[PDB]
């Protein structure tokens, strides 16, 4: 028939050269936009790409993971098609891989799927991604740690059930430790993930407090780095949006003195955020 379903037919071919050629083309189409992603889906590529995730052939695996992560970068309905095809069990299994290239690509697809709706984020949790993601926060490999933080932040940006699943997987003590990191990129991502957990209910905001995040957050307000300051202010302001018990905990941590000083900062974005955080605590 048409050119795209023919490429899909070559994905199960005994000729590995014919397989790689068709796989390379479908991957290139899937990286060209939502309309091009749908053409790949309609040709029936997803069941065939999912089958290739089990391949012991790293050359096939790298192109198949590249294609799926790109299909997962489209709309919510396109992300759902990736889940419906049964990609999540294969993606979760690849998190225990000693191959850093396969691992990073599995982390790309999982974070992209976890960037969809609440029910889609829940499907990533139900597949069992959280234990491996929490474990990867202890990795000495800065690239893997960042990809794992990105995937965790996307899961933590979900609703009550999703944030609760992140807390229950023991992600908070690891995230609080990462606040004392010499790496500005890692610090930003740990602050992004903490802000998302603190964007939940009063009990979930309290879990961030019980984890010991406030002393580290209050100290980050004395940073000469305006970018770190904005990230730290975003996290504290989310905690400030909690109940009176949570508001009092921020006051005891010594935030009011620092927030009063930050109202006089040269940077306008820092001024607005610190004034807003102080408004939440004093009222």
């Amino acid at each position: 028939g048409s050119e795209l379903p023919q490429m899909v037919q070559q994905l199960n071919s005994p000729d590995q050269q014919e397989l790689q050629s068709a796989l390379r083309k479908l991957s290139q189409i899937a990286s060209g936009g939502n309309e091009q992603i749908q053409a790949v889906i309609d040709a029936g590529a997803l069941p065939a790409l999912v089958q290739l995730l089990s391949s012991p052939n790293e050359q096939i695996l790298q192109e198949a993971l590249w294609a799926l992560s790109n299909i997962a970068s489209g709309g919510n309905e396109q992300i759902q098609a990736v889940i419906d095809a049964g990609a999540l069990p294969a993606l979760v299994q690849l998190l225990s891989s000693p191959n850093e290239q396969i691992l990073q690509e599995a982390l790309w697809a999982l974070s992209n799927i976890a960037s969809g709706g609440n029910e889609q984020i829940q499907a990533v949790i139900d597949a069992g991604a959280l234990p491996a993601l929490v474990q990867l926060l202890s990795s000495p490999n800065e690239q893997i740690l960042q990809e794992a933080l990105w995937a965790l932040s996307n899961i933590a940006s979900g609703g009550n059930e999703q944030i609760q699943a992140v807390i229950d997987a023991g992600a908070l003590p690891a995230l609080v430790q990462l606040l004392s990191s010499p790496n500005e990129q890692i610090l930003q991502e740990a602050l992004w993930a903490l802000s998302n957990i603190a964007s939940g209910g009063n009990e979930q905001i309290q879990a961030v407090i019980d984890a010991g995040a406030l002393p580290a957050l209050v100290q980050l307000l004395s940073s000469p780095n305006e970018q770190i300051l904005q990230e730290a202010l975003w996290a504290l302001s989310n905690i400030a949006s909690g109940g009176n018990e949570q508001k009092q905990a921020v006051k005891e941590a010594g935030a009011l003195e620092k927030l009063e000083q930050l109202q006089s900062h040269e940077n306008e974005k820092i001024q607005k955020e610190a004034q807003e955080a102080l408004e939440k605590l004093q009222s």
Partner: peptide
């Protein structure tokens, strides 16, 4: 919920 498409 940031989505990333391919390299660069």
């Amino acid at each position: 919920r940031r989505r990333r498409r391919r390299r660069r």
